[PDB]
RNA sequence: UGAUUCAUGACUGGGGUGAAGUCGUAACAAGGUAACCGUAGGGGAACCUGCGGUUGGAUCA
RNA sequence: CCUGGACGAAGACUGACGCUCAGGUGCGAAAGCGUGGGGAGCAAACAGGAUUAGAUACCCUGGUAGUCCACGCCGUAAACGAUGUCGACUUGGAGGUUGUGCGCGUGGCUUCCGGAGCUAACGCGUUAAGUCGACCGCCUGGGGAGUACGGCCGCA
RNA sequence: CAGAAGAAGCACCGGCUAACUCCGUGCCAGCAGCCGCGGUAAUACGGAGGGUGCAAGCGUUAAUCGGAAUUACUGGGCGUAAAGCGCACGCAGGCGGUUUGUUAAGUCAGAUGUGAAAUCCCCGGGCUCAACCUGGGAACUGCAUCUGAUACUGGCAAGCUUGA
RNA sequence: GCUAGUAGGUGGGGUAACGGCUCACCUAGGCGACGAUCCCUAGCUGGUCUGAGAGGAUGACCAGCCACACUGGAACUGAGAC
RNA sequence: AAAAUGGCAA
């Protein structure tokens, strides 16, 4: 397959670009409680399809800008 | 790197014979074994738990003539080795070439055995070994050098060894003046007077 | 404390400040005696304790105790100091190393000679 | 029975005339086979205090289910401010324990154990915590009986 | 509010044993019944029964060997505030194996010994001794 | 032209330590006006007084 | 007159819609502050009289702010049960108060005592400081100091 | 080959802490990690005799961790010892009754790739022994991917009535 | 609280190569209490010391990686260097 | 009614 991440769109203001929040559940190294951690990625959206609150699948790609190395695969869920 | 002081004082402090003399004569005749050394030796002070542990460790050291650094290393090895640490420790001390030479009867005392080993009068498996701390493996053959066979001390020591109880784990042939270390001595083979648990506890202090 | 509270704010260790700051984590420091004098100890002790004010190579100025019986230290004497406070002398956090640099060993010492810089008779 | 003097303390009460000093003695006695008791005695003179403690200790002995000179399982004991942990150890390990715990364990016939005392290390309370830990230790046979199982099943 | 029904069940057993109650009853759940089965299988409780349909109630019959409760200790391990999961190699041993650890594995709720036999890890529900 | 950090500065604030100094005696007993809390005013000083609050107040024959 | 909450009975209804809560926001005794009123009694300050070695006090005679009202500010108290909120569980006894069913029950709240257990002890003890779970706040030797400095807030 | 010849010191001895007396000194001189010791019978100062511990070292100082469960994840507390915000509402956050299905994120199992060598550990080999050198293994608790498991937790869907 | 090549877009240029790498134009974004920005300190790791462990402390020697070469700056040559 | 004060030592 191809490695993909699923996250919620948090910003769609940029032209052809979106900010996507990826949530990871990680065990705390000392305390051992499972904690939610967030990673935000700038993603390329060619058609400006995605909207804030949408759930999307993204894949890693070549650098497209200073902060963008990920592209939209599909919109899993609309807001 | 060796204790060169009076031997009987050590036995007097321990309160037991450490076999630091040949045993041709009784220790009582040679010294007041019961009394501790020095001016205040007659007084018997109460000994603390630390004191009891210290005295046991010092006794074992004084018997085999091992200084603290080497004895500590033996303890560390015994703890690392699988099985009973205290039993392992006694086995290591027994495995010393010095001790083996004395137990085979080539030396009257462990100190005499030490000089024999040091002065290159002893061979292990047909090779000369002059290291007192050398560890003898099972099935090793310890023999006096042909040059040293003529020495009067060795013959006298063999006679004294006959008087002493014979180690089961050692097979020795007189005249040939060779011996074989058949096996590592069991705890049962060694004296029950020694309390190795005190030493192990002391090193965990 | 709950795990959630510790996640937000982990357990914090103590500062653990040095009692011998003038040494700056060195075993000894060299200094010049600005003043050599006697000071009375705090109660319940009575004595005339020998001390020196010392300007160290690092520029700190401290008081150092002069141990043993008798000394040859004067102003402008170059001494070596080590850590070691004097309980009954407030503000004295260091000892002068006897038998180092200008400081002489204690005279007629037969026991603990190495602590007073005295060569074997 | 092996008897050990754990501690002797001088205590005082004040009277009109002045202070009245007396001595206390904490002792433990054991058979070296899982029977151990502690005694606390008080008297104006030290020997009298020790004798009273020894007499009490002999009548206060309890039974511990030792396994080959070691504990059956890790145990926790608590009395007043004293909290103790004890764990089985291999043969040749020795008694790795603090002083007050050491006396109890030795007379009880525990030859190998790993222990740690937490909280107050007051000897009187430590002895009680230790003995409390040992008394609540469970043998495999007793667990099997309570659970209505065989030891092999357990 | 009630946020750990399993801890509630364990506490009801603990308190009931302390109060020398012959039996303890509680609102039933599938997980609670699964745990009860392990307790009965290991001989910590005499029996269990479920009664009612709309609001089922689980009843556990406690046991005392010699007028002493068989369950000397029972403690929640994994809890909502801090979940505990262990690989098969790291499965806990209670009272040097004299006690049991109840473990939820993909093959169901079982003792640590059973899980170790099946070579399965899981969530450590509770220690029982 | 700002910010920050360090050093230094007539004088000044409070803090600590040190003589068996000087003035009182505020607290601990009902401590001789129960103490204390917040606040306000006053007074060489400890403190005093008002307002509300607390018991971590003694007494009861 | 306008208005908040609690509790009980017997049904109907919704269908986990819950618990906790950093930051935030609101409320918050007394004293105090601002503006405008009011002012009997009481009473910081103040004055005089006593007491005393002194008496800037206690006691006496007076007495202003203040205590009162409207509105705004302040945001603190031994603001205490010196005990965070929510839920479950675990022997009893005597009371108070407030519902309700048929003398006997069954709910809400509350006082005292006490069992196990707990606690350093004192004590707590189904209204837990017992046995557990969820979440938050907080502690880490005594002084220096809840002070300095900086920030924020405040008319002070 | 010749000859015991050429080869022992340092700290400590009031308690903690193994090891005690005499003389000198007399809150002095001094000691001291802590508690403390010293004002005329000092096992605490200084010397000596004796002893204890170490030993080609021994002490002292500096420095790290330990002991310290004394920042407590393992593993602590908060009525009176330090500690419950004066009270409450509430967003973020944490956590959440019960049933079925579904998913398989967490979780669990296996496999694959990687996790340099050295080091550490185990079993061996080589220097007279040891230190040291060295063969093979184990370990590197991790990360990623793939294939499975589905109890628990999470997601999604439909419920249920006991919480509200 | 921070940020105007700032964040994204389009096109041109540039590089061994993707890319605000650069530039023109367009849009107004981007980052931050999961701590941005600022201040202070610091080469990183394999490891090392300590510890029963979990931790804590540390990064000398040996090996891997990075950075620097009187100080500040710059390019040239070259497969590779600033 | 009034009714203050008393070095640190061991
Ligand atoms: K003194
Ligand atoms: K200035
Ligand atoms: K007063
Ligand atoms: K007041
Ligand atoms: K919330
Ligand atoms: K008035
Ligand atoms: K709270
Ligand atoms: K904890
Ligand atoms: K599931
Ligand atoms: K740029
Ligand atoms: K571009
Ligand atoms: K590290
Ligand atoms: K440079
Ligand atoms: K070239
Ligand atoms: Mg050596
Ligand atoms: Mg008074
Ligand atoms: Mg008064
Ligand atoms: Mg009072
Ligand atoms: Mg007044
Ligand atoms: Mg008011
Ligand atoms: Mg007003
Ligand atoms: Mg009036
Ligand atoms: Mg008046
Ligand atoms: Mg307050
Ligand atoms: Mg009130
Ligand atoms: Mg409070
Ligand atoms: Mg609330
Ligand atoms: Mg009560
Ligand atoms: Mg302030
Ligand atoms: Mg001693
Ligand atoms: Mg004298
Ligand atoms: Mg140190
Ligand atoms: Mg720690
Ligand atoms: Mg504590
Ligand atoms: Mg108090
Ligand atoms: Mg308090
Ligand atoms: Mg409160
Ligand atoms: Mg998965
Ligand atoms: Mg490697
Ligand atoms: Mg589910
Ligand atoms: Mg640097
Ligand atoms: Mg530890
Ligand atoms: Mg070129």
Q: Other C-beta atoms within 10 Å of D12: how many?
A: 9
CA separation, residue A26 to residues A38, B127, D47, E124, E127 (Å) = 10, 64, 65, 19, 25
Chain I bases near protein Cβ (<7 Å): 7-10, 18-21, 27-32, 34, 52, 54-57
- Determine the Cα–Cα distance for residues D104 and D134; give it in Å rounded to an integer: 10
Q: Other C-beta atoms within 10 Å of E26: how many?
A: 17
Phi, psi at residue C32, to the nearest 5°? -115, 130
Interval between CA C1 and ligand 25 midpoint (Å): 30
- Determine the Cα–Cα distance for residues D1 and A60; give it in Å rounded to an integer: 78
The DSSP result for D68-111, as a single string, is TTB-SS-EEEEETTEEEEEEE--TT--EES-HHHHHHHHHHT--
Q: How many domains does chain B have?
A: 2
- Determine the Cα–Cα distance for residues D10 and D13; give it in Å rounded to an integer: 11
For strand J, is any atom closer than 7 Å to the CB of C59? no
Q: Other C-beta atoms within 10 Å of B193: how many?
A: 7
Assess whether E51 and E95 both reside in one domain: no
Q: What is the extent of the structural domain holding B154?
A: 94-180
Question: D120: which nucleotide lies closest, measuring CA to C1'?
Answer: G120
Cis? peptide before B142, omega within 30° of 0? no
- Determine the Cα–Cα distance for residues D3 and D65; give it in Å rounded to an integer: 20
Contact in structure between B158 and B106 (CB atoms under 8 Å): yes
Which protein residue's Cα is closest to nucleotide G20 at C1'? E1
Any bridge partners for residue D4, and if so which? Answer: D28
Residues in chain B: 205
Chain J bases near protein Cβ (<7 Å): 8-10
Phi, psi at residue A68, to the nearest 5°? -115, 120
Partners of residue D111 in chain B, C-beta under 8 Å: 197
- Determine the Cα–Cα distance for residues B178 and A60; give it in Å rounded to an integer: 79
Give the technique used to solve this structure: cryo-EM
Is there a contact between E96 and D145 if contact means CB atoms under 8 Å apart? no
E90 close to A (CB below 8 A) = no
The DSSP result for C48-106, as a single string, is -EEEEEEEETTS-EEEEE--SS-----TT-EEEEEE---TTSTTEEEEE-TTSTTPPPP
Burial profile C12-36: b = 16 or more Cβ within 10 angstroms, e = fewer: eeeeeeeebebbeeeeebbbbbeeb
Contact in structure between E128 and E102 (CB atoms under 8 Å): yes
- Determine the Cα–Cα distance for residues D55 and D78; give it in Å rounded to an integer: 25
Is there a contact between B86 and D96 if contact means CB atoms under 8 Å apart? no
Assess whether B87 and B128 both reside in one domain: no
Neighbours of chain C (3+ CB pairs under 8 A): A, E
Contact in structure between A10 and A20 (CB atoms under 8 Å): yes
Chain breaks in chain C (C to N over 2.5 A) after: none
Assess whether E62 and E14 both reside in one domain: yes
- CA E94 from centre of chain: 13
Q: Which window residues (44-73, chain E) lie with Cβ within 7 Å of strand G?
A: none
Contact in structure between C46 and C106 (CB atoms under 8 Å): no
- Determine the Cα–Cα distance for residues B126 and B142; give it in Å rounded to an integer: 8
Half-sphere exposure of E109 toward its Cβ, with a 13 Å CA cutoff? 20
Any bridge partners for residue E23, and if so which? Answer: E61
Residues of chain A numbered 11-70 and touching chain C (CB < 8 Å): 28, 30-33, 35
Q: Of B84, E111, B16, B62, nearest to D70 (Cα)?
A: B84
- Determine the Cα–Cα distance for residues D93 and D113; give it in Å rounded to an integer: 7
Q: Which two tokens stand for residue C79?
A: 């001494």
- Determine the Cα–Cα distance for residues E120 and D84; give it in Å rounded to an integer: 34
CA separation, residue E30 to residues E24, E55, E56, E58 (Å) = 17, 13, 10, 10
Q: Which two tokens stand for residue B163?
A: 């008087």
Half-sphere exposure of B25 toward its Cβ, with a 13 Å CA cutoff? 6
Residue B101 belongs to a domain with what CATH number? 3.10.290.10
B82: Cβ–Cβ under 8 A, 6 or more apart, which residues? Answer: none
- CA A4 from centre of chain: 10
Contact in structure between D139 and D72 (CB atoms under 8 Å): yes
Residue E111 belongs to a domain with what CATH number? 3.30.1490.10
Contact in structure between E117 and E67 (CB atoms under 8 Å): no
- Determine the Cα–Cα distance for residues A69 and A43; give it in Å rounded to an integer: 7
Collect contacts of A61-66 with beta carbons under 8 A, ≥24 apart. A65/A17
Instruction: Output Rg (C-alpha) for chain B, integer angstroms.
Output: 17
Q: Which fold has domain D2-62?
A: Double Stranded RNA Binding Domain (3.30.160)
Report CA dihedral (B118, B123, B128, B133) to the nearest 10 degrees: -50
Residue with tokens 């009801």: E12
Assess whether E56 and E81 both reside in one domain: no
Q: Of A33, A35, A32, A43, nearest to A8 (Cα)?
A: A43
Contact in structure between D67 and E96 (CB atoms under 8 Å): no
Q: Which fold has domain D63-147?
A: Ribosomal Protein S5; domain 2 (3.30.230)
- CA B162 from centre of chain: 17
- Determine the Cα–Cα distance for residues D139 and D65; give it in Å rounded to an integer: 6
Q: Which window residues (33-62, chain A) lie with Cβ within 7 Å of strand H?
A: 33-36
3-state SS, residue D41: strand
From the CA of C16 to the C1' of H63: give the distance in Å.
13
For strand G, is any atom closer than 7 Å to the CB of E82? yes
Assess whether E9 and E61 both reside in one domain: yes
CA separation, residue E77 to residues B93, E5, E37, E60 (Å) = 49, 13, 18, 21
Assess whether E61 and E9 both reside in one domain: yes
- CA A6 from centre of chain: 6
Residue of E nearest to A33 (CA): E82
Residue B75 belongs to a domain with what CATH number? 1.10.1050.10
E16: Cβ–Cβ under 8 A, 6 or more apart, which residues? Answer: E23, E24, E62
E strand or H helix at E114: helix E112-117
Residue with tokens 């000071």: C39
From the CA of D61 to the C1' of H31: give the distance in Å.
49
Q: What is the extent of the structural domain holding E22?
A: 5-69
* B5: exposed, middle or buried (Cβ count in 10 Å: 0-12, 13-18, 19+): exposed
Dihedral class, residue E59 (left if φ above 0, else alpha if ψ from -120 to 50, else beta): beta
Any bridge partners for residue A55, and if so which? Answer: A8, A77
Domain spans of chain C, in order of start: 1-121
E strand or H helix at B197: helix B196-203
- Determine the Cα–Cα distance for residues B185 and A36; give it in Å rounded to an integer: 62
Q: How many domains does chain E have?
A: 2
- Determine the Cα–Cα distance for residues D16 and D34; give it in Å rounded to an integer: 48
Assess whether E64 and E78 both reside in one domain: no
Q: Please, what sign has the CA dihedral across residues B148, B149, B153, B157? A: positive
Phi, psi at residue C74, to the nearest 5°? -135, 170
CATH of segment(s) C1-121: 2.40.50.140
Name the resolution in angstroms: 1.9
Residue of A nearest to C2 (CA): A31
- Determine the Cα–Cα distance for residues E70 and D142; give it in Å rounded to an integer: 10
Q: Other C-beta atoms within 10 Å of B133: how many?
A: 14
- Determine the Cα–Cα distance for residues C50 and C86; give it in Å rounded to an integer: 11
Assess whether B83 and B99 both reside in one domain: no
Chain H bases near protein Cβ (<7 Å): 8-12, 16-21, 27-38, 46-65, 68-69, 71-73, 76-77, 93-100, 105-110, 121-123, 128-130, 144-146, 148-153, 160-163
Domain spans of chain D, in order of start: 2-62, 63-147
């Amino acid at each position: 397959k191809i490695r993909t991440l699923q996250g919620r769109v948090v910003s769609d203001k940029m032209e052809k670009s979106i900010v996507v929040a990826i949530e990871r559940f990680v065990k705390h190294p000392i305390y051992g409680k499972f904690i939610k951690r967030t990673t935000k990625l700038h993603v390329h959206d060619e058609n400006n399809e995605c909207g804030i609150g949408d759930v999307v699948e993204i894949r890693e790609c070549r650098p497209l800008s200073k902060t963008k190395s990920w592209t939209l695969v599909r919109v899993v869920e609309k807001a | 790197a060796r204790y060169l002081g009076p031997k009987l004082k050590l036995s007097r402090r321990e309160g037991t014979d450490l076999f630091l003399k040949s045993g041709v004569r009784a220790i009582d005749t040679k010294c007041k074994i019961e009394q501790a050394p020095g001016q205040h030796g007659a007084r018997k002070p109460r000994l603390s738990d630390y004191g009891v542990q210290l005295r046991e460790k010092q006794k074992v050291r004084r018997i085999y003539g091992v200084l603290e650094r080497q004895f500590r290393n033996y303890y560390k090895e015994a703890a690392r080795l699988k099985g009973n640490t205290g039993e392992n420790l006694l086995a290591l001390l027994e495995g010393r070439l010095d001790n083996v030479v004395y137990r085979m009867g080539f030396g009257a005392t462990r100190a005499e055995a030490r000089q024999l080993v040091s002065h290159k009068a002893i061979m292990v498996n047909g090779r000369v070994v002059n290291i007192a701390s050398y560890q003898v493996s099972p099935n090793d053959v310890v023999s006096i050098r042909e040059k040293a066979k003529k020495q009067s001390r060795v013959k006298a020591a063999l006679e004294l060894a006959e008087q002493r109880e014979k180690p089961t784990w050692l097979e020795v042939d007189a005249g040939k003046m060779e011996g074989t270390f058949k096996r590592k001595p069991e705890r049962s083979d060694l004296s029950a007077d020694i309390n190795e648990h005190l030493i192990v506890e002391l090193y965990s202090k | 404390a709950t795990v959630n509270q510790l996640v937000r704010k982990p357990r914090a260790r103590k500062v653990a400040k040095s009692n011998v700051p003038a040494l700056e984590a060195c075993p000894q420091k060299r200094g010049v005696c600005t003043r050599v004098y006697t000071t009375t100890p705090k109660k319940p002790n009575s004595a005339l304790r020998k001390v020196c004010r010392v300007r160290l190579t690092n520029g700190f100025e401290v008081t150092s105790y002069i141990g043993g019986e008798g000394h040859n230290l004067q102003e402008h004497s170059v001494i070596l100091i080590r850590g070691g406070r004097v309980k009954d002398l407030p503000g004295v956090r260091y000892h002068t190393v006897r038998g180092a640099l200008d400081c002489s060993g204690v005279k007629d010492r037969k026991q603990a000679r190495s602590k007073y810089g005295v060569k074997r008779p | 029975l092996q008897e050990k003097l754990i501690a002797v303390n001088r205590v005082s009460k004040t009277v009109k005339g002045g202070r009245i000093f007396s001595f206390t003695a904490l002792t433990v006695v054991g058979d070296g086979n899982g029977r151990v008791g502690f005694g606390y005695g008080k008297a104006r003179e030290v020997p009298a205090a020790i004798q009273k403690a020894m007499e009490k200790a002999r009548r206060n002995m309890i039974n511990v289910a030792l396994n080959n000179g070691t504990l059956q399982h890790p145990v926790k004991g608590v009395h007043t401010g004293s909290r103790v942990f004890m764990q089985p150890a291999s043969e040749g390990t020795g008694i790795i324990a603090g002083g007050a715990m050491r006396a109890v364990l030795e007379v009880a016939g525990v030859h190998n154990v790993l222990a740690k005392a937490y909280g107050s290390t007051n000897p009187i309370n430590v002895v009680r915590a230790t003995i409390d830990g040992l008394e609540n230790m469970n043998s495999p046979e007793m667990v099997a009986a309570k659970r209505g199982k065989s030891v092999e099943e357990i | 509010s009630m946020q750990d029904p399993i801890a509630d069940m364990l506490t009801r057993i603990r308190n009931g044993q302390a109060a020398n109650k012959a039996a303890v009853t509680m609102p039933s759940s599938k997980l609670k019944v699964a745990i009860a089965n392990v307790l009965k299988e290991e001989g910590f409780i005499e029996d269990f029964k479920v009664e009612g349909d709309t609001k089922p109630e689980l009843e556990l019959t406690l046991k005392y060997f010699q007028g002493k409760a068989v369950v000397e200790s029972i403690q929640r391990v994994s809890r909502p505030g801090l979940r505990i999961y262990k690989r098969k190699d790291e499965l806990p041993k209670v009272m040097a194996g004299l006690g049991i650890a109840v473990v939820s594995t993909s093959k169901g709720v079982m003792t640590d010994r059973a899980a170790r036999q099946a070579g399965l890890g899981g969530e450590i529900i509770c220690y029982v001794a």
